[PDB]
Amino acid sequence: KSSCKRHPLYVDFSDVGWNDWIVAPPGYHAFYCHGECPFPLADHLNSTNHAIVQTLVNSVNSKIPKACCVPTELSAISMLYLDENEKVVLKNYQDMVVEGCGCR
Amino acid sequence: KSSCKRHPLYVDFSDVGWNDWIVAPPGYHAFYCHGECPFPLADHLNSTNHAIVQTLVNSVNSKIPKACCVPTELSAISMLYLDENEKVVLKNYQDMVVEGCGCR
Amino acid sequence: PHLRTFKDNFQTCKVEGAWPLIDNNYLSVQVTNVPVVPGSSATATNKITIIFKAHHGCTDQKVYQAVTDDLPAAFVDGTTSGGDSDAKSLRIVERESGHYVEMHARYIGTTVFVRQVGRYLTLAIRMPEDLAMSYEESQDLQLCVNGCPLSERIDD
Amino acid sequence: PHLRTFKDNFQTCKVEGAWPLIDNNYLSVQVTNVPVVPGSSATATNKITIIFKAHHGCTDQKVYQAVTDDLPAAFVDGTTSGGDSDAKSLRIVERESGHYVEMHARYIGTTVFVRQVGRYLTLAIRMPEDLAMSYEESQDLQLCVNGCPLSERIDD
Amino acid sequence: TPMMPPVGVQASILSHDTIRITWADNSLPKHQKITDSRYYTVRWKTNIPANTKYKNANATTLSYLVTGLKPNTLYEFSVMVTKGRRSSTWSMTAHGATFELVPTSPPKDVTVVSKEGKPRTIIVNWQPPSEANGKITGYIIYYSTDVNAEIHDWVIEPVVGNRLTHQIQELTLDTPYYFKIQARNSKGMGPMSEAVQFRTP
Amino acid sequence: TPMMPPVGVQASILSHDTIRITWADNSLPKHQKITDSRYYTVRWKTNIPANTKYKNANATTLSYLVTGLKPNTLYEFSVMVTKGRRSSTWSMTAHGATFELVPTSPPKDVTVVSKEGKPRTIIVNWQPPSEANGKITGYIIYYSTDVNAEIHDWVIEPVVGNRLTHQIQELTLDTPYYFKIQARNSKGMGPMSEAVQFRTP
Amino acid sequence: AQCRIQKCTTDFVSLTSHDSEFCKALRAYAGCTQRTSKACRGNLVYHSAVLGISDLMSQRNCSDPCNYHPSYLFCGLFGD
Amino acid sequence: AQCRIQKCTTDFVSLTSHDSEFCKALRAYAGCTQRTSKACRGNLVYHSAVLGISDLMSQRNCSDPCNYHPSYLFCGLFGD
Numbered sequence A, B: 001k002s003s004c005k006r007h008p009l010y011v012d013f014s015d016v017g018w019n020d021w022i023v024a025p026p027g028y029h030a031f032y033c034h035g036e037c038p039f040p041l042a043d044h045l046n047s048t049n050h051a052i053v054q055t056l057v058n059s060v061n062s063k064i065p066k067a068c069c070v071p072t073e074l075s076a077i078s079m080l081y082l083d084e085n086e087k088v089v090l091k092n093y094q095d096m097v098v099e100g101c102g103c104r
Numbered sequence C, D: 001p002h003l004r005t006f007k008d009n010f011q012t013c014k015v016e017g018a019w020p021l022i023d024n025n026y027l028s029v030q031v032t033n034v035p036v037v038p039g040s041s042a043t044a045t046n047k048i049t050i051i052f053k054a055h056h057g058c059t060d061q062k063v064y065q066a067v068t069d070d071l072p073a074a075f076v077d078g079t080t081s082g083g084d085s086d087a088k089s090l091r092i093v094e095r096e097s098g099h100y101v102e103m104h105a106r107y108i109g110t111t112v113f114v115r116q117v118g119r120y121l122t123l124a125i126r127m128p129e130d131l132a133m134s135y136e137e138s139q140d141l142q143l144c145v146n147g148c149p150l151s152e153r154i155d156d
Numbered sequence E, F: 001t002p003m004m005p006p007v008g009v010q011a012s013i014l015s016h017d018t019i020r021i022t023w024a025d026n027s028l029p030k031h032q033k034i035t036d037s038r039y040y041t042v043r044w045k046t047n048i049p050a051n052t053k054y055k056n057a058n059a060t061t062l063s064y065l066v067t068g069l070k071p072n073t074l075y076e077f078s079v080m081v082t083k084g085r086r087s088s089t090w091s092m093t094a095h096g097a098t099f100e101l102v103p104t105s106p107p108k109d110v111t112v113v114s115k116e117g118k119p120r121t122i123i124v125n126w127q128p129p130s131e132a133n134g135k136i137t138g139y140i141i142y143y144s145t146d147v148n149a150e151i152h153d154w155v156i157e158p159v160v161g162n163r164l165t166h167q168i169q170e171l172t173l174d175t176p177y178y179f180k181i182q183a184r185n186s187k188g189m190g191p192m193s194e195a196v197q198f199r200t201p
Numbered sequence G, H: 001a002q003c004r005i006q007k008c009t010t011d012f013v014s015l016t017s018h019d020s021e022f023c024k025a026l027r028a029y030a031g032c033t034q035r036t037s038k039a040c041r042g043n044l045v046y047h048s049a050v051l052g053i054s055d056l057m058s059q060r061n062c063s064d065p066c067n068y069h070p071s072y073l074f075c076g077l078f079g080d
């Protein structure tokens, strides 16, 4: 009884043990998806036909589980680290931040 | 302690209540994904950087949940139904069958 | 065949072919008759059709038809009753283990019977006075109301 | 300055500039000396360097250096000991609340002392006989072994 | 001792000639499986015409496709199971009724006469088509003095669906007229009846 | 009554001049938050040279970047918290040691003399560079009779890292020679020493 | 120009976000779908939605007159 | 030509699929990663893997000699 949404999540690289390699940033806002995928929502989209068929199957036979709340759209962010020579590298990491959730 | 895999699932359209509209087939093999996404697997791919960052966060703070086992590759199938005039329509439905699972 | 009109008088008529006994705002009854022996003037009835016309909210249209050797206890559409599930405003029943059937149109206080006698059909109708007379004019040709046209009568 | 050799004899030498007291397979000791008054032949020591050469599995290389008014209780790299955590095969200690430091190289039974006296440094070494003599030849110039070259001596 | 009958029997109408029947067997492990050499027998009938006897089908699936039905007709359906020697009685009977089809026979028994007292007026009586295939929403009367005139050049007279007699006024005396009628329903117009010849007095 | 000190203090070496310190405060709600006007004070020092005094930094984050450190040098690190009036004592001290850098000063105290008994042989003594910046893996001795000769035309003599004296044999008598030395470590070659002039007998 | 089930769903969702609380909006959604009915003939989202609504229709459970009113006449046609 | 962490993971996975059961293969995986170490300098999968292995390294927990051997000499250099 939450329903599939995006929730915030700031990853502190000290807290996670990446601060030995990432010069910057100190951490980033990754977010995460969480919540249930019921009879209208998994319909609602973004959802795959499969997700629809699955949630419908769940509705008949609850041994088969409902679809899952996951990131359906993500963005990239840039980060900094050092090369062999202690010189900076700026590198763009795909699929880091959740821009949208959905059922799959 | 299962780990994210594909499991079989045949959707019987009588059993689901689509047999009033789908002339053929009687049902289809949709499959579904299920299983956990631990420290090597969510690494293993197909997985999004985010999924990796999330499972790593889970490992520090289990209040944030692990990534989710979902279909990462799907196929289409054709189905038959009748038009206004009781004439057949063959229609190709995208994302019906799970061809692969992964963590997201 | 032998006709008894609403007005309580008998007539024997040829009326070979298709003929309306009733044709009013509520009901139509149509008979096909045919010579009892070839080249004869005396006739009998081999087809009987009834149309219970739609009465808003009570029954949709239903149609009984029977012919020599096919005397069903249902309307053409396979049903045995009209409209509402709870209301039997119109229903049809088999009687005398199949040898005749009767239709109760409660909504128009009308009762209709159809029977097979040997190779032909008899028909009987009981109907409220006013509703019988409801027919619009120039819709005048109804045998039950006016009788046979004189030309179609055996007794000169 | 005043030199006491391994062989137990004294000498007073000029040896101005950079000079090796020891230079063998285990240890190097290097001093920079300078005239005690300008234009004088009599000298004193203002820099002392020691290199504890790497002994496979016991310590990696370490280096002590001290100079007038900078007499640390650590090696150049900031550490206070060599290699193994559990083994103090080589360690350095402050003594006389800082006025001299001593180095215990257990691995080569060698003890070295460095002290500040006014504006200069004294040095003392105690070393096993065999290991002292381990130096390869044409590596002959070690003051502790052979003494000063005659030309570098104050007492003709 | 006696095997339960199948339950939850449903018809899903698919076309004017075709309905799918489905049913459940509580006998079997749920959601769902068939694992043994049992079979289902499906039966179906209507009331028209009088005294139809049942039709049968054997099936190893919990669904059967009933084809070749009359249009606009209500059918009833029931199922029994058999497993080797043991059979069940029949299920709860479930009903389902086929969609309409355009009519496919002409109106029957076209009968024409002159009106009593007025000879310039004639009366057409007829009977509905035996293959009406749906609720008759009207008829169309065609007439001509030239029986061979192209059909679109005949006089066309629309007529309501619930009347089997109709009056046409204002004709010529001592004249052969010819008549055809046709039926219509929600799905279109049926075939034309044979021309019937009548001569005014 | 007395505030706990921060714990779990770690150094992560990032470069020859730079280490990041991180620490934990059990005082705070876990995994994680900072919510009040408290602050952390970070201190750091080495042993070289003799009697360095500590360096300080105030920080409102559980991480601090310590810059401008000497290469190849071990540093120690500790943290205390303060909240208005109350402060804590210092944390468990944690150590971390900067990476190497190519040397940046020349060798010092280059001293040249002729060998006793053999005048065609000379002896070079020196002292390591004060900015060695890493374990010295060797030196290189340069010499020429022409002090102005281009550096690549001088005689080049490689030498091991752990010897501060070396012999060069087979020279000409009554001859001015000039000498430069340079240091090398795992990261490369340092600058050349000033030329020192010496004349054979 | 085609199946507008997407609109029915969104509208329903908004109303639900805000006893027979749901049931007002369920019956509305159900009407909506039936109105885009024939456009959605082969549409997977529609056919699921349909069963989806009626699933929720179960939880909570949502969603003299003809007899003639005094004498009669009789007509008949008989064989002998 | 670049970070081969993908191989370390797959190899590890196969071995695990098949007390110090894991720990044989964990220590192997850990070696593997350290060997592709410098190629994976900015690689997200590598840096997670590293912590990932050492996470599992905790559960189950996996993974006279120098003193001189008899007389001495002395040398010194003194100021006065």
Ligand SMILES: *[C@@H]1O[C@H](CO)[C@@H](O[C@@H]2O[C@H](CO)[C@@H](O[C@@H]3O[C@H](CO)[C@@H](O)[C@H](O)[C@@H]3O)[C@H](O)[C@H]2NC(C)=O)[C@H](O)[C@H]1NC(C)=O
Residues within 6 Å of the ligand: E041, E056, E057, E058, E082
């Ligand atoms: C539907 O399935 C039933 C049940 O399996 C079928 O019934 C079986 O039909 C055959 C052929 O009529 C019967 O054969 C018998 O053969 C002997 C001679 O060998 C003869 O004496 C018989 O009177 C009979 O014809 C068989 O016994 C019978 N079995 C049962 C249990 O009824 C049925 O044929 C199937 N039919 C349809 C139309 O779906």
Ligand SMILES: *[C@@H]1O[C@H](CO)[C@@H](O[C@@H]2O[C@H](CO)[C@@H](O[C@@H]3O[C@H](CO)[C@@H](O)[C@H](O)[C@@H]3O)[C@H](O)[C@H]2NC(C)=O)[C@H](O)[C@H]1NC(C)=O
Residues within 6 Å of the ligand: F041, F056, F057, F058, F082
């Ligand atoms: C790091 O943070 C500490 C704690 O906040 C700072 O200590 C504060 O520093 C100021 C400046 O030294 C002190 O000011 C005082 O001013 C009066 C005159 O108004 C004078 O009599 C003093 O002796 C003193 O200078 C302030 O009292 C002091 N507070 C505390 C609690 O120590 C410190 O300055 C920061 N420094 C660095 C280098 O990070």
